[PDB]
Amino acid sequence: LPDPEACAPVCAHAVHLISDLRSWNQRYGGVVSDVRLIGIGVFTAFIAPWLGPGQLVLPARTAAWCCALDDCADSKETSPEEVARLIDACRHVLTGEDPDTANPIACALAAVRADVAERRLSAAFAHAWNRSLDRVLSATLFECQARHDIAAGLPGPSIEDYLARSTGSILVEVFLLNLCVAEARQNAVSQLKALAPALSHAEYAVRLGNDVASHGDINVIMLGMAPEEARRRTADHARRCRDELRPFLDADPRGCAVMLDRATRLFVGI
Amino acid sequence: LPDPEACAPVCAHAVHLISDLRSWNQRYGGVVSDVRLIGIGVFTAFIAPWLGPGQLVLPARTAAWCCALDDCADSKETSPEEVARLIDACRHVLTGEDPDTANPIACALAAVRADVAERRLSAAFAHAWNRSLDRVLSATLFECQARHDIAAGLPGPSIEDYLARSTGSILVEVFLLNLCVAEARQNAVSQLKALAPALSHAEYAVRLGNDVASHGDINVIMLGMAPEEARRRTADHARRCRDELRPFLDADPRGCAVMLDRATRLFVGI
């Protein structure tokens, strides 16, 4: 059973974070569904239990922002063309421009980006942050297009292309990059680069595992993969991620690799 | 650090429970503050991590209901006479009557009581449930009266009387009784009786610990106890509770005693 003493402050972090996210959300129009806000608050705290609540704010809001984008693009009335225009406006926000749209998703992005900038980290971290969000934007448009295509009688993407392109919306990288910087600040970029092979396996495991569980939604099972095969591959990727992490976990029990190991084990374990 | 595998389903329980409580709350007018709802959802799940989300609903709603009562009685504009009338109406609800008031606190009580009754447990469990809530009602009126008395220039209660009478609003018993019945059903009453000595120490530890931390509120430090003495006594009671629990914890690692041990360690650890 989880140790009560180890859990107690982690539970308390979660309560503060869930409350923060409700306020931030209402500040930006109610862009994210409440149940996702709750999940982000709980899981952020359990990924990195040694961080203070103040260090968890950025990561949690950045993840919440990604969930809004996903909700908006999951509308039945919006076209891939409409989603692409929203995506474009967000990419312009990432370069530092003010939103060229009244869509509150773009406003919320500019707010969270400003929060990052306030801590004046290197060209390199700001770059890495933008890139991670550009992956989420690309993956979102990919999934939207795929849903539109299937509903228009097209075959939709191949299974391997789906896995390669939809892993960008899995968020693990967003949690990792944003939490790692609190702990490692200036060294986070290099640590993140080193974890790329493990991170790729963690992403595939969580995508596969999520898809098996959910089985409008496009998923790997409706594309033709058998549930037992999606379960097999989830486990196989999870093991490969752990094997890639072992040398880092041995060197530091409170570093970025541990955060990746915890996130993967938390998200595969649901 | 808390084990990720052990935590993962417990985190998922929490998310469902926090969401449940928001809906129930809105059903009954918004009687409890959101931040308390979040705390109840998180901590319920970590007290009894081996229970399913469906088994956690009752306990969490019963605890939420106690927090509403406390919010209502913590109004600056309501008199002890007004609070006593609310308390009286709730005691009538506990006997099975329909609320004789339009106060939504009484309505919410009747709803949760109905939820209990639906599972047709013995005269004895229903009795124990009512008694635990009567303690919370009595303690609430005591604290309200004490606040009124201090603000009217009276000395307020002695420290030992404050501790004896305000422990009823601590909730540990509410979480314990309600969670224990899910696991032990028919045997819960006798198990609860056996844990009375430990429970008394757990209550005193959490009251002392809560009061130290909060330092309108009446608390033991403003009544004259030094912070270091309140901290000493918190630790001493916590140890005594553990010594009383040891024989039960040795006999069963998934029973009601473990729930009391976890609740005490969680609530003292914040």
CATH of the domain at B246: 1.10.600.10
Amino acid at A241: C
B269: chain A residues, CB-CB within 8 Å: 4-5, 7-9
Amino acid at B207: R
Half-sphere exposure of residue A200, counting CA atoms within 13 Å on the CB side? 7
Distance from C-alpha of A125 to C-alpha of A118, rounded to nearest angstrom: 13
Q: How close B270 gets to chain A, by Cα (Å)?
A: 6
B46: chain A residues, CB-CB within 8 Å: 2, 4, 7, 11
Q: Are A182 and A191 a contacting pair, CB within 8 Å?
A: no
Instruction: Considering only the beta carbons, identify the residue of B9, B15, B34 that sits closest to A269.
Output: B9
Q: How close A71 gets to chain B, by Cα (Å)?
A: 18
Half-sphere exposure of residue B128, counting CA atoms within 13 Å on the CB side? 23
Distance from C-alpha of A93 to C-alpha of A152, rounded to nearest angstrom: 32
Quote the DSSP letter at residue B30. S
Any CB–CB contact under 8 A between B15 and chain A?
yes
Token pair 């099972």 in the structure block, residue = A221
Kindly state the tokens that stand for A222. Answer: 């409706």
Radius of gyration of chain B (CA): 18
Q: Which residue of A has its CA nearest to B8?
A: A266
Closest to A267 (Cα-Cα) out of A228, A238, A232: A238
Question: Which helix (H) or strand (E) covers residue A192, if one does?
Answer: helix A188-194
Three-state SS at A153 = coil
Distance from C-alpha of A129 to C-alpha of A58, rounded to nearest angstrom: 12
SS3 content of chain A, % helix, strand, coil (to 5): 75, 0, 25
Give me the residues of B, 129-168, that contact A with CB < 8 A: none
- Tell me whether residues B266 and A8 touch, CB distance under 8 A: yes
Distance from C-alpha of B249 to C-alpha of A124, rounded to nearest angstrom: 53
Quote the DSSP letter at residue A74. T
Any CB–CB contact under 8 A between B230 and chain A?
no
Distance from C-alpha of B39 to C-alpha of A41, rounded to nearest angstrom: 12
Q: Are A19 and A60 a contacting pair, CB within 8 Å?
A: no
Domain assignment of residue B167, given as a range: 4-269
Amino acid at B150: I
Q: Report the sign of the C-alpha dihedral through residues A43, A47, A52, A58, in that order.
A: negative
Vertex A178: Cα angle to A176 and A182 (nearest 5): 110
Distance from C-alpha of A258 to C-alpha of A192, rounded to nearest angstrom: 12
Q: Which residue of B has its CA nearest to A268?
A: B8
Instruction: Considering only the beta carbons, identify the residue of A35, A49, A267 that sits closest to B15.
Output: A35
* Deposited experimental method: X-ray
B38: chain A residues, CB-CB within 8 Å: 14-15, 18-19
Q: Are B201 and B258 a contacting pair, CB within 8 Å?
A: no
Amino acid at A116: V
- Count of domains forming chain B: 1
Task: Give the end-to-end CA distance of chain A in Å, rounded to a whole number.
Answer: 16
Q: Report the sign of the C-alpha dihedral through residues A201, A204, A207, A213, in that order.
A: negative
Kindly state the tokens that stand for B252. Answer: 């069963």
Report the helix count and the strand count for chain B, using DSSP H and E: 12, 0
Instruction: Considering only the beta carbons, identify the residue of B9, B42, B268 that sits closest to A15.
Output: B42
- Tell me whether residues B7 and A266 touch, CB distance under 8 A: yes
Instruction: Considering only the beta carbons, identify the residue of B34, B253, B269 that sits closest to A4.
Output: B269
- Tell me whether residues B1 and A4 touch, CB distance under 8 A: no
Any CB–CB contact under 8 A between A261 and chain B?
yes
B8: chain A residues, CB-CB within 8 Å: 265-270
Kindly state the tokens that stand for A19. Answer: 């409350």
Token pair 């595969």 in the structure block, residue = A268
Instruction: Considering only the beta carbons, identify the residue of B11, B35, B268 that sits closest to A266.
Output: B11
Q: Are A155 and A188 a contacting pair, CB within 8 Å?
A: no
Q: Which residues, 6+ apart, have CB-to-CB distance to B61 below 8 Å? A: B20, B21, B24, B112, B115
A9: chain B residues, CB-CB within 8 Å: 269-270
Q: Which residue of A has its CA nearest to B51?
A: A1
Neighbours of B134 (CB within 10 A): 15
Q: Report the sign of the C-alpha dihedral through residues B239, B242, B244, B246, in that order.
A: negative
Surface-to-core class of residue B74, CB atoms within 10 Å of its CB (0-12 exposed, 13-18 middle, 19+ buried): middle
Sort residue A243 into left (φ over 0), alpha (ψ -120 to 50) or beta: alpha
Instruction: Considering only the beta carbons, identify the residue of B4, B43, B269 that sits closest to A9.
Output: B269
Q: Are B38 and B61 a contacting pair, CB within 8 Å?
A: no
Which residues does a chain break follow in chain A (C to N more than 2.5 Å)? Answer: 215
Q: Report the sign of the C-alpha dihedral through residues B209, B215, B218, B223, in that order.
A: positive
Closest to B207 (Cα-Cα) out of B259, B240, B235, B166: B166
- Tell me whether residues B35 and A15 touch, CB distance under 8 A: yes
Any CB–CB contact under 8 A between B7 and chain A?
yes
Q: Are A212 and A227 a contacting pair, CB within 8 Å?
A: yes
Picking from A3, A5, A7 by the largest number of B CB atoms within 10 A of its own CB, the best residue to mutate is: A7
Which residues does a chain break follow in chain B (C to N more than 2.5 Å)? Answer: 215
Instruction: Considering only the beta carbons, identify the residue of A22, A43, A270 that sits closest to B34.
Output: A22
Torsion angle of alpha carbons A155, A161, A167, A169, nearest 10°?
A: -40
